[PDB]
């Protein structure tokens, strides 16, 4: 009956779910377990560039904390 | 004696005007139609699982013609040609000669299923219940020539379907 429609909807649901989960996890993998930083304004990009210089491995997601000080 | 469809005047009171304005702006009637379709979605479908499930038929069904025999095995048809006369599409061609036993039998009985209209005549005319449209309906063919039946084909159909045909005639012979 009407439940027979459900399997196609479920396959479509999985297919639609795949890209969002893929994007989230790819961002996590590329940005070191943190969300990809969002730079909608030049100040945020300047912060990202400063982090890249500070990291020393030329990767912004690498974060240097109080340990680098003194 | 007569009824007026339409011919109704809407009320002009503020409540009725507000209701109709709501219907126009808020799409109420469209929502009602949508709800009807939704209910039909949740209703059980009427499809039968052909070929595993077959549509109902009555004993008087008119399908593939089938020449029948007597219980002794002698072919019932007695070359009366009454069927050829009533045939409204002249799909029946009958030729007869006295057979060796001396009985009046048909040397040729051809029913062109490509010209026949499945009227049910002949079945109601044959004085000896010879040609009787059988219950079979799924006898489609891949070539035109297969549908030009011969007396041998009709007798084979009768032999094949006699078990059902006799029962159907028994069911309906009192109504006739």
């Amino acid at each position: 009956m009407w439940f027979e429609i459900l399997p196609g909807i479920a396959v479509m649901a999985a297919c639609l779910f795949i890209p969002g989960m893929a994007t989230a996890h790819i961002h996590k993998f590329t940005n070191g377990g943190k969300e990809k930083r969002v730079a909608h304004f030049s100040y945020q990009w300047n912060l990202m560039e400063r982090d890249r210089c500070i990291s020393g491995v030329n990767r912004y997601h690498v974060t240097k904390g109080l340990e680098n000080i003194d | 004696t007569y009824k007026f469809v339409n011919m109704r005047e809407p009320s002009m009171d503020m409540k009725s005007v507000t209701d109709r304005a709501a219907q126009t702006l808020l799409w109420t009637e469209l929502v009602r139609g949508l709800g009807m379709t939704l209910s039909y979605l949740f209703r059980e479908p009427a499809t039968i699982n052909y070929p595993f499930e077959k549509g109902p038929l009555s004993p008087r069904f008119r399908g593939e013609h089938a020449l029948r025999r007597y219980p002794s095995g002698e072919e019932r048809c007695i070359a009366c040609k009454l069927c050829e006369a009533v045939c409204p599409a002249q799909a029946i061609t009958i030729e007869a000669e006295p057979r060796a036993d001396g009985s009046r039998r048909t040397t040729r009985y051809d029913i062109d299923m490509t010209k026949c209209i499945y009227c049910g005549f002949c079945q109601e005319a044959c004085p000896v219940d010879a040609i009787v449209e059988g219950p079979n309906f799924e006898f489609s063919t891949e070539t035109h020539e297969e549908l030009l039946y011969n007396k041998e084909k009709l007798l084979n159909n009768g032999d094949k379907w006699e078990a059902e045909i006799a029962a159907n005639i028994q069911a309906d012979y009192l109504y006739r």
């Binding site: - | 499809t47 052909y50 799924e138 297969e146």
Partner: protein, 156 residues
């Protein structure tokens, strides 16, 4: 041979694709169109089998000649058949379309649609019951299943 095996499996695949998705064209001249619609009706719904009515001859795969084919209508029927892409199959429904039926001796009736276009499956009846039409369509599907196009190509 391995090549024969690959060819046979590919032909099975293409035949299955063609028979599963049979798109008849919305072509009904006379009474048998009513029984055709009843086949499309919920009881014997053709869409379960992959049979979907598509108006465009260019987007259609099977032509069901449901009705009496008159001399005036015959050239149009031939034209619509020709504009239909291949593989194309023709199913003749009704005594009128098969051989002229009730109007076989009419001056204005083509005595069978086989004279105008080739016919693959003939569905007897006047009108053929919708179940008979569905049976004819399934017989056409089996006929497609038996096709050996790629096998014959490999054998040459």
């Amino acid at each position: 041979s391995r090549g024969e095996y690959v060819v046979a499996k590919l032909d099975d695949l293409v035949n299955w694709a063609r028979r599963s998705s049979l798109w008849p064209m919305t072509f009904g001249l006379a009474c048998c169109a009513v029984e055709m619609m009843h086949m499309a009706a919920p009881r014997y719904d053709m869409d379960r089998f992959g049979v979907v009515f598509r108006a465009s001859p260019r987007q259609s795969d099977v032509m069901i000649v449901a009705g009496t084919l008159t001399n005036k209508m015959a050239p149009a029927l031939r034209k619509v058949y020709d504009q239909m892409p291949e593989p194309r199959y023709v199913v003749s429904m009704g005594s009128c379309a098969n051989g002229g039926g009730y109007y076989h001796y009419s001056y204005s009736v083509v005595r069978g649609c086989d004279r105008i276009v080739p016919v693959d499956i003939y569905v007897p009846g006047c009108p053929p019951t919708a179940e008979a039409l569905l049976y004819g369509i399934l017989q056409l599907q089996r006929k497609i299943k038996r096709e050996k196009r790629l096998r014959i190509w490999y054998r040459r």
